[PDB]
Amino acid sequence: XXXXXXXXXXXXXXXXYQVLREKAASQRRDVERALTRFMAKTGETQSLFKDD
């Protein structure tokens, strides 16, 4: 079969349930902290310590 016949490649299952929703929720946390850092250094800023 290694020369004559052929096959088909789908190649991406990735269906690991808890791992999937870990990916999604971790990404949501990322976008949270990203926009936080952005408007953090963007707008009027007051701190918790001095100069953070």
Partner: protein, 187 residues
């Protein structure tokens, strides 16, 4: 629940002051509450109720000495153009600040704003939970109410309080708690 992750005993000697960027799980809690404060600055969902619980959390963090005992955040949330509930929780917070910490100046500010603001219900709740949670507690007078604070308080019972009945009723409650049935040990 994170506010009820009360950890009083990290700073053994002096760790208040950006020293560890104080550590370690406290910082994670700080990350989450910082997130939610800026989310409700952006999203805001329903009365800034999240922001309210956050402000209570930040004060309880000051009551364990991790973010230092500084009112200027809460002061910047006792301002005019916010919601009531934000403002009302900031006032509860800064009242306990002036309870345990001995800030004379912000007490003076507080009484000046009891005099001066348009909203009634903040004056109502300032005086209510000021009396529920007092500084200057009677016959325990280390922060020296006898100097001129009795004077201005007597004034605010008399003056500046013919707006409403209940404001001077609260001032009656103030003199009930602070030095009730007597001379205040002035003269």
């Amino acid at each position: 629940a994170l506010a009820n992750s009360v950890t009083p005993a990290v700073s053994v000697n002096n760790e208040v002051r950006t020293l560890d960027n104080l550590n370690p799980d406290v910082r994670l809690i700080l990350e989450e509450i910082t997130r939610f404060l800026n989310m409700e600055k952006l999203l805001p969902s329903y009365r800034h109720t999240i922001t309210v619980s956050c402000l209570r959390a930040i004060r309880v963090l000051q009551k364990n000495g991790h973010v230092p005992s500084d009112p200027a955040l809460f002061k910047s949330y006792a301002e005019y153009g916010h919601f009531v509930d934000i403002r009302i929780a900031a006032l509860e917070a800064v009242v306990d600040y002036t309870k345990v910490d001995r800030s004379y100046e912000e007490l003076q500010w507080l009484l000046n704003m009891i005099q001066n603001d348009p909203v009634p219900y903040v004056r109502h709740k300032i005086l209510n939970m000021l009396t529920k949670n007092p500084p200057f507690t009677k016959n325990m007078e280390s922060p020296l109410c006898n100097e001129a604070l009795v004077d201005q308080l007597w004034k605010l019972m008399n003056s500046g309080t013919s707006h409403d009945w209940r404001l001077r009723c609260g001032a009656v409650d103030l003199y009930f708690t602070l030095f009730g049935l007597s001379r205040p040990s002035c003269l």
